[PDB]
Every structure is written in C-alpha cells, then in structure tokens.
Symmetry: D2
Subunit: 466 residues, 4 copies
Amino acid sequence: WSSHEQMLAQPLKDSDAEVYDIIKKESNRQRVGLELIASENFASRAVLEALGSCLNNKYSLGYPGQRYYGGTEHIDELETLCQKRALQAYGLDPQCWGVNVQPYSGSPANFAVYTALVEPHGRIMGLDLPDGGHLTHGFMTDKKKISATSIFFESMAYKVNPDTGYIDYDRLEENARLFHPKLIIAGTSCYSRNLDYGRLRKIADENGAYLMADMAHISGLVVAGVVPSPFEHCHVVTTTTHKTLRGCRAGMIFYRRGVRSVDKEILYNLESLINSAVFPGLQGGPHNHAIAGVAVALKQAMTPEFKEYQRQVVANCRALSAALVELGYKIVTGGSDNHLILVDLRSKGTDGGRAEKVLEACSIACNKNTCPGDKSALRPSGLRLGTPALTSRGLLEKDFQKVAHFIHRGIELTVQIQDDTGPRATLKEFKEKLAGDEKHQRAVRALRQEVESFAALFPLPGLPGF
Amino acid sequence: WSSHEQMLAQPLKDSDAEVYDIIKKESNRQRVGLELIASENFASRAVLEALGSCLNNKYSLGYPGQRYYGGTEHIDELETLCQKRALQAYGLDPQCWGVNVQPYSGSPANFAVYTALVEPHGRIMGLDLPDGGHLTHGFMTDKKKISATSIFFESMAYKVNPDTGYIDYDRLEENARLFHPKLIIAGTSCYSRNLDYGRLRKIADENGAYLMADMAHISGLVVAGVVPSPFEHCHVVTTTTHKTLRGCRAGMIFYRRGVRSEILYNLESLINSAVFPGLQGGPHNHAIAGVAVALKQAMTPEFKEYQRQVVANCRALSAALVELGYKIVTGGSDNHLILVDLRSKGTDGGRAEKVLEACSIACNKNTCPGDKSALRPSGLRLGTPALTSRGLLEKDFQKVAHFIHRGIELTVQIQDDTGPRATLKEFKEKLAGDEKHQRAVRALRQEVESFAALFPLPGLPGF
Amino acid sequence: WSSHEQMLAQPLKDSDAEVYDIIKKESNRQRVGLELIASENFASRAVLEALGSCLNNKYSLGYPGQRYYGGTEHIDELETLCQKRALQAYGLDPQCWGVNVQPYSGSPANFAVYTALVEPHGRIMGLDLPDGGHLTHGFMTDKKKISATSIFFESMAYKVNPDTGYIDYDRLEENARLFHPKLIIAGTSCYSRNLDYGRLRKIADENGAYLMADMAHISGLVVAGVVPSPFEHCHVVTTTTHKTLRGCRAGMIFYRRGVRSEILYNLESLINSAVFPGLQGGPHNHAIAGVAVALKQAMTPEFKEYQRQVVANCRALSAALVELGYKIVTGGSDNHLILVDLRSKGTDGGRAEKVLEACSIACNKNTCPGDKSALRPSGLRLGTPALTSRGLLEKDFQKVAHFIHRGIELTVQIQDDTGPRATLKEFKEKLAGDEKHQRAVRALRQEVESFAALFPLPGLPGF
Amino acid sequence: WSSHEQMLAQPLKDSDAEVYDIIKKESNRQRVGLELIASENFASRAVLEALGSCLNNKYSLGYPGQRYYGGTEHIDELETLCQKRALQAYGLDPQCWGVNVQPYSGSPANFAVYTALVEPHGRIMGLDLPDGGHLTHGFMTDKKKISATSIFFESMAYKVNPDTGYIDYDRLEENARLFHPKLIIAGTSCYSRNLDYGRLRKIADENGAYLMADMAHISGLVVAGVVPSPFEHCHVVTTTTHKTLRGCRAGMIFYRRGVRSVDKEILYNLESLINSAVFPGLQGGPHNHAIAGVAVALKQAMTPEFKEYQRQVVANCRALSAALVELGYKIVTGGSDNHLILVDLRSKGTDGGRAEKVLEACSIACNKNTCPGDKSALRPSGLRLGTPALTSRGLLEKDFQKVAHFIHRGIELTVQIQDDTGPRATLKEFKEKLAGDEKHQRAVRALRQEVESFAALFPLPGLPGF
Ligand SMILES: *Cc1c(COP(=O)(O)O)cnc(C)c1O
Ligand SMILES: *Cc1c(COP(=O)(O)O)cnc(C)c1O
Ligand SMILES: *Cc1c(COP(=O)(O)O)cnc(C)c1O
Ligand SMILES: *Cc1c(COP(=O)(O)O)cnc(C)c1O
C-alpha cells in the first residue's frame, strides 16, 4: 500500500521484466535482419522520446479553437504547432489548405473523410486490391462486404491494365459515368508508378465527385519533392505519418479551403465537415503524445538531410530493381518511380506465397502480393519489396546489389523446396516440408547466417538498443 | 549521410527544442494544479517506457496465428501475453471469455462491436447523454445525427428518473419492446451509482438483444473488486485502458466464448473481423505493450489498495461538500465520481468550471437529470482517481472541498456583480476585468498551487 | 383475320364461360349473405361502368401539363376533373390543398408519401397493429421486418391504453422525444373512436415531424361531415377510394399547399415525383374515371344521408349487442365499426369468425387491446357500411345482432363439446363433423340467407 | 334519401354525364387516329366486361392457400384458374415454375421482386435508360436518385454499343465482376432485337446473382412463339398484362421452383420470398376484377387467332421498317426482331423531340427516344414506333406502307417548321411556331384529314363505341 508510490516510478526493467525481455528480443530481431517490407521504417529517437511524454496524461476533447474542458494552453500550442509544420512541410498556403492531425492512424483518417463527404451508402471508387489498392479504399466479394468502407458505403473498384501494369484511366472514366461516384480515391499500397492526379481530377469533376488522395506510401517522397505532389489536383489528401514519413503511428487529413468554383462562386465546405466527422463523430480524446511525435517528425522531414535520405531511397530502389532484372527477374510495369517494386515471381517458376516464407526463415522480410495478371488470389505471383527501412540504416546502391543476391539465393532455395513438395501440393504442406526437412533447413541456416552478418554491419535507429 | 545517421539519434531536447519546451511547461502545469476531472489519471513510468520502445517499428497486420506478414515471433509473444493478463486481471476463464486488444482507443472499440453485432442501421439503445451517457452510445437531435453511432446505426436513448437520479429500468423495459434493440449498452460517463447488469440482462434477453457493457470509467474499480463486475451478466464488455485502469490510451473488447443456450456464441470471429480487416490497419504494438504492463500493475495488491483509496476519497469529498451545503445527484456515490448540482448555490456548472480553472482546479460542467437547458448545465462532475494517484487521502480531499467551495463562492460573486441575468460572455469579462476579482483568483490559485506541490507527480523522472 | 376481328368483340359470356360462371356464383354469394366486414362495400353501377371503358387503352405517363406522350387532351380533362371533385368533396381550397389521384390503391399511396417525405431509413411512428393499426403504418417483430414500411424505413409503434381502449397520447408524446420521428401516422383499421388530430399535430410540430392521416376507413364519413375532418390539422391525408367512400379500388394523396410558417410547403413536388417516375408507371385511367364518378356521388345529399344511416346502424347494432351481454371495446363507437370483446362470452374471435362464416355471416377476428396472445384474438370487428348500402335500418340491424348472437352461442357449443382446452383445428373438426352441429349451422345459415335476400344488391343489373 | 337506392343503380350516362362525355370523346379520338405507340394496345370486349364485375366488391387478403378472411370459395377458384392459365400459356411445368398474379401493374411487380431477392441497398444491374432501358430497372444521375429502384437499392446500368445498336455483353461481363450485382435485369422498353438470355445467364451465375427478365414489351410475342422465350434461362420473369399480351392493366411474377443447383443439391427459395414481398409486404387487397380480366386475356392468348395476330404484328413491323428504309430513314441496329423500331431521325436533319409534336397534331401518335449515339438527352434523335395497336385494328403489310408515307409526310412537315424557327431555337418556341402559324397549321389540318380518313376504315376493338 505504501509501495504503490514506488510502483508508479519503478523503471520498466525492474517493474515488468517479462515485457522488457520481449522488447529486447524484438529490438535484436530488428537488428540482425533485412527489412524489405515497403510499409515499415525506423522512427528517430526524438520522435520516440515524445511518445512517452507526460502528454499522455492530458485529456482534451475538441480542437484548439473550441475545447470541451479547460487547461489546454500547451496542448493548443502543440496541436497548433503540429498543424503549422504539416502545411509548411508540404508547402501549402494556410489560406488554401487546412489540416486535421487527430486521426489515430491511416485507416481512421480515411474513414473520417468518407463519413464527412460521402455519407452512408454513398458511392466511392478506389483501386482494386489485387491491382495494388488498399482495404480502406473498399474491399468486397460477391457474397460479403469485408472492409468497413464497403460495409458502410457503396464501393466499386477500378483496375490496372494487366498488360502494362498501369492504371486503366480510360475504363475508369467510362465506368464513373455509369456508377456516379461521390468520391474517387487516388492512392495505392503496391503500385510502383506515379498517379495521374490531373487526369483523375478531370474525371472527378466530370461526375461532380471529390478527388481524395491517400498518399500514405509516398508522403515522405512528396515532402522531399522526389515524386509529383498530389496537392496540385486533389481536394483532400490523407496520410499515415509512419511509413516513408518516418514518424510514429498517426494520421492526417489535408483539405482545401476557400473558393471551390465560379460561374458567382461557391465555397469549400470541407473543413467543418471533416473536423466534425473526426470529433465528435468518430473519435474521442486525441492522443496528444502521438501528435507531439508527428510534430517532431515533420520538423525532421523538412531538413535537407531528409531530402537527401529520400533521394537515396529512390536511388536504392532503382539499383535493387536493376540488379534483379539482371538476375533474370521480371518487375511489374518494367520498373519503378518510387520506393517499391512488385517482382513477378512467375518468371522463375514459383509464387510469392512460398517465397515469403523461405525469405522470412532467412531473416529477409517482405510480403507476397498478386500481380495484375494472376488468375488466383490463393497463389499470388509477386513479392513486394521496398527500400525505406534499409536506407534509414544507411544501405547504398552497392549494398542493395548484395541484397538482390541474398533475395535471389532465397528464391533459388524456395524453388528447390517446391520441386521437392510436388505438383498439386498445398502451402500448408510446403510450410511443413520447410520445417521438418534437414536438407532444406540446412540451406536456410546457412543463408540466414550470411544475411544476419551483413545486417549487423549497419546501425539500428531508435533508443539505446531498446 | 554522416549527419542523417545521427539526426535519428539526436535526443529530443537537442533535436526539437520547441516541442521539448511545450512538454516541460505542460508537465509543470500538471504538477501545480488539482486534477479533479473524472476521466484523467497519471500513467506509471514503466508504462510510458514501453510506449517509446522499438515496438513502434513493427508492422503486424492480423492476429497471433492469423498474421499477414512474417517476422512476428515476438509481437505474437507480446499480443498473447497481453491477452492472457487481460483475462487474468478480471478473473475470466479463457474457455468462457476472449479478448481483442487491438482497438486504438475507447471509441474505436465501441464502434467495432456495433459493426460486428449490430450491422448498418441496426438498433442500439444507450443512456441519454444529458443523463450521464457517452457519445459513442448514440447522440442525435431531431434535425441531425452527430455521433457516428447515430449516423451509421439507429439509436434511441433511455433516461434516468429526474427525481431519484437513478436509471429508470422500468421505462426502458417498456420502450425496448416497442423499439426492438439489437444491442443495449450499459455504461456511463457521469453516473455515480452501480448499474443493474442483471436487470439489464433480463431486458436484453427479453428482446433477443445483446447486452454490452462499456466499463471505461470503472475498469480500475472492477479489477480491484471494489464495485460489481459487469462480466457476470454481459455478452460483451469494452473498455479504455487509461482512466481508472491507469494505463496508456487504448481499448479492449471482451467477449463471451462457449455455449449461449445447443446454440453457441459467434462473437469472437465477428468482433475480430470487425476490428481488422474491417475498421483498423496495423495495430499500435507499443500501446499494447503499455497496456500489458498496466494490466500486470493492476493485479498487484498495491493497486487493489489504490482503488479502495480512490472510492474512500470520493466518499470523503462528497461528505465534505454535503456539509458545506452542496447537493449531490442521487444523494451520493458508489464509485470514483460525483455530480454536484450547483443549483443549490444559485449558479451553474458553466460559469463554475471557468472560475475553478483559473484557480488551477480542473473539472468540467455536466447537466443534471433535471436541467431544462443544455446551454446552462447545473452540475460539476468531480472525480478522485488522478489526485489519489498523487497520494491524497481523506483529510486532503476535505481541504480540496474547501478550495472548490472558495471557487464556487467566487464564481457566484462575479455573478452578483453581473446581475441575476447576464450572458456567459459577460460573466467571463467581469472575472478577468475587475480588480477585486482577478485578484481573488490570483489569491486562490496561489493557495491551490502551494497545496498541490506538496504531492508527487507520477511519470518519467523529469522532462 | 376474320375471326380474330370478332374474338375481340365476343361478349364475356360466350368468350370465356369458366370465368363468367365464377362471377355469377360470386355475385350470388354476395347476395344471400350478410356482409359485416368493416372494409367492404358495394360500388354503384355507374362507377363499374367507367372501369370497363376504353380508358383502359390510353397510356399516359406523367401528369396534366407534365405528360410524356401526346394525345392526352381527354385524359387531362379527366384527371383534372377528378382532382377538382376530390378537393370539392372534402371542402378544400385549391390554394391551400392539392391532390394526387394516381395511386393504384391504399397501400401504394401510403408508401409514396413515406418515400417522398421520409426517405430511406427515416423514422415513422404509427398505431401498433394489435391496437388497431394498419400494416402500411409499420409492422415488425424482434427478429424480422414484415411490412414494406418496416423494411425500407425505421418504424416504431405507439399503443392504446388497454384499460380505456383509447390511444395513449401522453406516452406517445414522451416516446416521440426519444425516437425523433420524421413522420407520425394518424389512421386506424380497427379503432371505433375519433382521433385527436389537434393533439397529434402538437406532438408532430414538437419534434418537427409531419402529421399524416390515413383516413381510409372513414373517408366516406368525413365527406358527409359525420366525423371530424383530419384536414384541419394534418399536412397530408391519404385514402383508399373504396371502403366507406364506396368507389372502385384506388388511392389518393392530399397535401397542403402554401405557407407553412416565410417558409413554404414543398409537399406537392416531392409527392408527385415519388408517385411517378418514382414508384409507378402508367396510371390506371379507368380507375380514375371510376373515382371521379364516385366523388360526384359522394357529394349528393343522398350520400350524406347514407352516411348518417351508416353511423346510426352501428349505434343500434352495438346497443343490441350490449343488451345481449356483449362487451364493446372502449364502450362504444363514434364511427362505422365496433370491436366486440368475445372474452365476455368465453370464446375468441378466432373460432367465432369460422362459425359465423359457415352461417353466411361475414366478419373477421381482431385482437383486443388487452390480449396476451396474437394466436387467440379475443375480438370480432364488425362494420355497417356494406349492409347499409343494401338498405338495412336500425330495426334490421337488431335482427342481425340476434343472428350474430346465435352464431356465438353455436361456436361456444362446439367449444363445450371440445373441452375448455383444445386446439383450433380440433374445434373446426367438431363443427364440420357432428350431426347436431353441422345441423345447427345449416339451420342458421338458412335463416340468414332468407333475411339477406329481402334486400337489393347494388351493382350492374345482373351478371 | 329514398333516391339513394336509385343512385346505386342509375346508369353512368344518366348518373354522371360529365365523365360519360369524356369517355365518348376519348373513344372517338382513339378511333380516328393512328396509334403507333409501342406500349399501347386495345383490350378485347370480354376482358373489359370482367373488370366491371361484382368482383370489385370482394376484399380478400392473402393467397388461395391461406387467406386472412373467409368467404373466398370463388375468389380462390378465380385466382387459381388465373395462375393455371398463366403457366399454360407460356408452356411451363408447375413443378418447375410458379406464378404470382396479384401485382397491380408492371412497376409494382418489378419492385416486389427486388424487395424479395435483393433487399435494401442490394445491387441491381439493368439496361441504361437512354440505351432503351426502363425506369424500374434503375434510373439516377450524379446528384439524385430518381426511380424507386435507385432510391431503395444500389443500381448501375450496362449499355449498348453505340456503333452496332446492340447490347455490349462483353463490357457487362467485365463490370459485373467489379460491381457484384445481386440481380441482373434483362428487359427493355426500346430495343428492337432479341436478348441473349443464355449469355446473360452465364454472367449471372458467374457472380452468383439472379437473372430476372422483364418481358413486359414482348410477353405477347413470347406466347405465340414468335421470339425466343426468356423462360429457358431466367430465374424470374415479370410482366405487365397489357401491351402486347393485350389484357387489362396488371402484372405477374413468374419464378422457378425445385432444385436450383447441385454439388448435395440446394433448392429455390423464390416462391415464398416473392409471395411474402407482394403481400403482406408491399400490397393490400388484390384487385380481383383485374385478375379476372387477366385470366380472360390469357385464355385468348392461347388461341390460334392470337398466334396469328402476333405473326402479323411482327410482319407489319418488318414492312413498316422496310418502307421507311426505302424512304431514306435509318433504323437503329438496321432493323427489328420484334414489334418495334427506333428510327434515327438525324438522317433527315431533325430530332424526335420536334417530330413527335407534329405527328401528334396530325393524329399520328408515337414518342421520342434517344438513340445510342445521342450526346444530349434534351434533343433525342429518334422516334420509337410499334405495331401491336394498329395490327389489332386489322392493318396488314400494305396498310403499314401507307402509314410509312403519312409518317414521312409528317417528318417533312416538322423539318419545314424547324428551318422556319431557326438555329439555336428552343422546343418551347418550336411548339409556339407550330400553333400560331397559319402557314404550318394549314399543312397539319390537311395531313390530319388524310390520316383520320384512313384510320376510320378500320374497326376499334372494345365495348359498343364506348
Ligand atoms: C498502410 C496504409 C494504410 C493504413 O494505415 P494504418 O496506419 O495502418 O492504420 C492506409 N492507406 C494506405 C495507402 C497505406 O499504405
Ligand atoms: C471516456 C470514455 C470513452 C472514450 O475513450 P476514448 O479513449 O477517448 O476514445 C468511451 N466510453 C466511455 C463509457 C467513457 O467514459
Ligand atoms: C384497408 C386499409 C388500407 C389498404 O388498402 P388497399 O386498397 O387494400 O391497398 C390502407 N390503410 C388503412 C388505414 C386501411 O383501413
Ligand atoms: C411499360 C413497362 C413497365 C411499366 O408498367 P406499368 O404497368 O405501366 O406500371 C415495366 N417494364 C417494362 C419493360 C415496360 O415496357
């Protein structure tokens, strides 16, 4: 009862060792492995220091202008600061753009926008999942609506041409006239090319819809001016703050302000609709410590060191892609414009499903993804590979070429295990063959060793080995 | 680069001073003031240490055994550990109960349950807001649906009797037959009594509905066995992990497993599917680690102690206010908070929260069951969790009752100088623009901050 | 062809004898029996002559002045005439009221209004079915939405006090604040009293809702000025044109025009758009001609007379039944029908409607406000419109009360031979399978058919 | 008060002269004019005699098997008879097909099926209106949902190829995979070719949807075996009973019964869903007199005189179309397979909007309709023309050739008035020029005279000049 006070002060290491132990083992796993997953990255030490601040303790509903309670002098300073830096980082004029920084994550942010501009059962159009789209853009089958976007709104996808790997803007322009979308989403999870915001904008205006850009995967590249900005043509732009922006987990909603169109002119009503949808609509108290982390990350994103980091990110992808082409791999759309590439593993007689398990055992992380062609979702042909994470650890073009060879070694290994499993074998069985087979298990042990040795040569951002 | 390598290592203090400065000023404000807001509390140092871990970097879509990406050996250990401790802390048999720990916060958790059990336009019944209910339980007017619960589902509220301050279970039982709810919510934001879970459960079963308990405000009291557990009669129980449980911000959804009547429970898969891939993306692992750490602390006897203290202080605080002539809604309290009806002093919570705020005493206005206007709320909601974490005891809270009283007297004064009838904007003008008054505040604040500084402020050493 | 030319000219009798035979047998059944069903009536010969006109052949999408096809000079004359007579018959100023006469029937009319003023998932409040409400006002259970009104909109019922038999306006006023209806329906299928339109209107305005009156059952009484007009307080009034108005089957939607409060009424265009192109296609012109003919007859003093007679007979019928020991719900009636609570005789309307049916006395079962079961309805609904059109007067209805009584006694008997507890299928078996009984029926039927034949049967000369 | 009885017996002529007068003037208008509107026809005398029967007086809720009230011995005989004749007329085995005959009209029938199989906000796919579709198949714009089908369900249209005039089945097969319809509608209001039920059925089964056929416009041709039956591939078939079937106004819903598919087999659940949706779902008491009329019409539809009438209907269309082609007119899809044709008036420098008004003044009835091309809905290019009505009056191939010339005279006249109105003139003004111009008004008066003389040579089915 008297030790209760020594409880709220006791460091984590002493307080709870079981959790401490896990954090350590995870920190170590992150260190000796190769992170090639397009969505992961390492947050800076400063950003992580903000998350554990006393900002966790302040409960504040509403926005800076109008809060439900008092005692928000500093929380207002903070939210305001965060909003200013966000507009600044993307070079936006606060008279033409606004920003909400309360979303808890990427998904929540998207959902808030649909709830504000679309309304229940409203129509939304997004990139089909197998063609590189995201769940929050809509996902359903003929018998069931899986994603929330599909459960509460009426969604229909547009696809990419399976022969070019690019988005079929023509067919989208046609279907939009039949579907009458209230909002069209321009954003992807596994697409290596730049989106034609200008064309998508012409299509949106043609049907009187809104053009929303979910730039979660390229927000970092956009700030460094390495890829066209979606802010030139969209009405709204949402984004996670982790991934390429390299902050903590949180989301943001950017929206236009001022005169929309003329004749005599009509105004943008986005701001109030969106603010109302986030709160009191969908959320409660904002996670202030997360806003502080986002703020810290936006300041770092405007440094020239970051702009450099990003040019490096893109350059490594080119090198990685070139090295894999030379090794005989087929890259969707032939190449990339950003930080990732979708490797069509059919050109090697295997599929991404079995390939991600073998590479994983070898401490090389990445994930399977269907290629535009793919006649089956149960046997995805590709592997999605990104460079943001490894580039933060300092890898350069020559380093990524070595990575290309490790990945290749892995694909060769997975192919060996596939011929050993059979023709109509199941992924369930493949995974068993991969664990209970000394012959294959030996190869893995070997490759993993070379991968972990190489990985250890580079630093691991964050707090002191924690 | 050579500098980019260290930019990611530069401590916050050096890296970004503008934000660092803010965190310091806020930490200080938290120290010299009296936190009487029922929903706030101070998270322990250990919990905060987990939030800033390298767990922020791991992206893990899915659940343990149902992961999308590889390399989740430890994230699985962590999520699993967190789920085990959650069931343990509330004394639940994993054969009869399950738990999802991915919700980002309280609201998200509630919304996921509605999405899983109710479905679009389904009917939901919750406690009316002015009667102490929460937004996520439904909130609409005759011309507009404000809360998401009201926008995507069909909600209708049940009220409390304005003469007793208690929930009118009889009228609810009657309306439920006409409304046909698919889910009834049992949870409150400003109600000082225990909920009759057993009666609410009989009503739910009568209409074939589900009984969901949103125990966000009393999850801490429940773990310490200080107030009846909603786990005895509900099908689902959601909860924030901050507030009385004293963790970081996150939410949890508890759901029954096993036989319902032979018919079985289908909650688990519906709820898991609704959280992800339904509503959320990658889970905030660092928050799950914080929740895990908080659940272990919640099972210590020191916590059990902390909680009995929380309830005790409320009783003392309420008794001291009654003696000072204040009227407590429903006469008293069973938990950690009380709704003080300020009509008994000729003022309203609207003006009173601004004056107490100026004096570094934090709390908020709330309408009393009677109240014929939402623009002039009669009460003040006061909670003890936060100050109790700083070590205040019964005698300390009696001194607090006097500070609050001083405040009410002061708010009344600015009100007597304004005249029986005057807008709120006038009242504030007279408070900030008067020698004798802004002077009164300055004085009271000084006594409040001196008293406050005598107690510790939990958290990381010092920002 | 030479025969195809005449196939289209061959009279029904020669053309299709099988159908002709059926029409004859039905016309005869209608003659020798006693029609006591509150919703049935006999349409005049003139009205029936219009239905078979060459108006069936004209396809006219749209409205007068808003037609889609050409060649509508006369269809416009007709629709316009019909609209003028409708407003006239109810004494409405075309500057304050409008009317749509395209609905195919009562139900379609109601549905069009909901679709125009309420919108998908909008809230509607109507009289509960077991308390004398109609399906189109909403009908659902805890597990399923039966009526279309319940499937496409969110409906909740209000009830009558089971101790007075009257609508509980107080409880409705209370629930309306919690439910927030967008439209409240004031109309009944089995309620013998006048509705308090003024009170319902105050409640509608309190929640910003619309007050719709479905006067299908009393449209005839309203035209004759025999019962208060719902046109004094409602925004919209829908109605079937058969039943008490005595026309052919069709519906009408009356809606306010002008200033609502300066805010104006937007009903007209919403309602017109909802009927077409919204819900319907080409209007049934021959039915509109029949309605027109019926509205002219409704304004004659002979009709005004017919109606006072209708109400008078009900009073006599109810008084004679009270004297025979029967209990009338809410003690009596204000209109054309009465709900007889058969519990006062130890039987239920379920068994009683089958026995009276066998005796050529038609009517139907209906639950009484009390009734703890929908599978064993306590009452019998009885109306006088139909028999009054055949010329029955007060003295005649007293004889009818005796036939009905004889019937109740008989149904009770088969019930005493079955034992205090026995399923319904048993009861019917004993009725049709017993010498003394099937014999009783045969006897009573004979007296009923003899009495019935003494009166004329309106309609075309003789089929 | 005593005359009240003489009121319910007084004939219409004496009772209400104002309405009687209207019926007469209308009967006469019908006689001296040429009915070329594809949806109109003349009901036989027998059918009209049933409508005014004492069947109007019987109120009966429910279906033959289970009614809410008693005294339905004959109403059951009648409904049952009507159901038997309906299945018979279309050659359906009552073990494989069922029928509901309570719908009040075509629209109500369609709506009942959507409500039973689709459910609120369910997805439906129908032929686009400007491409010859019907309102009840769905009709909306980017800013508003007009038709009830669009207000209560989520509809999206499929189009016809504007270069061939035919339905683009390929594009529909593609969009159906993205839209996931729960029901696909196969039926048209202005399409002159036969629908590929077999292909549409393959597409329905591909998405697990239902194939509904709205054969309102060709129900008569189907009974005479003059055009392929939709009953071979559809799950449900709805239909009005007027139009080509030549009965009174009412609707019917035909639905499959028995085993749907195998594996072990699953059954059809259409019957109960559809019956429940009609009542107590959407309707109240059925219009018995209308069911009697439908019954009488179905018996006439099975006579060889009818089968002959129908072959005649189709033959006249061919002749009419051939005569118009020879006069230089362009028929959409080159010709017709059924009873109607869409004449593209662009080939003459005018539009259907102005043409329908001039022909109307000349007592030649028909209506405008957009052609697949048409870049504007406010200036429809075509005229829809049908032969059912005139064929019932006895016109034959040679008669229709004379009709083609009257129509031509009309088009020539409308073109004269168009050059006289101007370039950017409005249809509002065109109509004024047409009424306040003796020059043009003289032409009309003349043509009308020749049209009415020709029309009077033929009989007008129905009751004795009433
Ligand atoms: C990852 C991603 C998201 C989801 O973000 P969360 O923060 O995980 O919830 C949304 N949209 C796009 C385009 C993404 O890449
Ligand atoms: C505070 C509270 C919430 C909201 O929690 P958040 O974490 O702010 O999102 C939900 N429910 C109840 C009952 C509460 O008291
Ligand atoms: C009978 C009745 C109806 C239904 O009329 P239909 O013509 O059968 O479609 C609708 N409303 C009320 C109030 C009624 O009594
Ligand atoms: C005419 C038509 C309809 C509408 O019928 P109504 O009886 O006028 O209500 C429906 N569908 C099709 C295909 C049609 O041609």
